[PDB]
């Protein structure tokens, strides 16, 4: 069975040096679109393949609604 699969190939030499590019350059974009509603100032964006975190520092104290409306 020959299945067409044009996506990324986990198993190249490239599979970790370009999972840290393609995931940093993705989350640098999705952190730009949520700044139309909440104005913040991001501090670090650490990325490890898929698994990444990105600390956001706000103006006010973080409440139970800014956590819910960023996760949404």
């Amino acid at each position: 069975k020959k299945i067409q699969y044009g996506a990324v190939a986990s198993g190249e030499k490239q599979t970790k040096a370009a999972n840290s590019i393609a995931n940093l350059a993705l989350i640098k974009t999705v952190l730009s679109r949520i700044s139309n509603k909440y104005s913040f100032a991001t501090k670090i964006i650490r990325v490890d393949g898929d698994d990444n975190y990105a600390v956001l520092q706000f103006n006010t104290e973080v409440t139970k609604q800014m956590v819910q409306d960023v996760s949404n």
Binding site: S32, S35, N36, A41, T42, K43, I44
Partner: protein, 50 residues
């Protein structure tokens, strides 16, 4: 509108926030999308009419 891929690459290479003296934070260019410029046109007229 002006395309977002054009204005950001002129704004992130004239500002050059990555090569600044401060490295305590990751600095990049935020909120230059085509949804906030379309939203500041709605807010700045409707909060002025009413």
């Amino acid at each position: 509108l002006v395309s977002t891929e054009a204005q950001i690459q002129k704004m992130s290479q004239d500002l050059q926030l990555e090569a600044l003296t401060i490295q305590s934070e990751t600095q990049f260019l935020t909120g230059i999308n085509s949804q906030a410029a379309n939203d500041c046109f709605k807010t700045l007229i409707a909060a002025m009419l009413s």
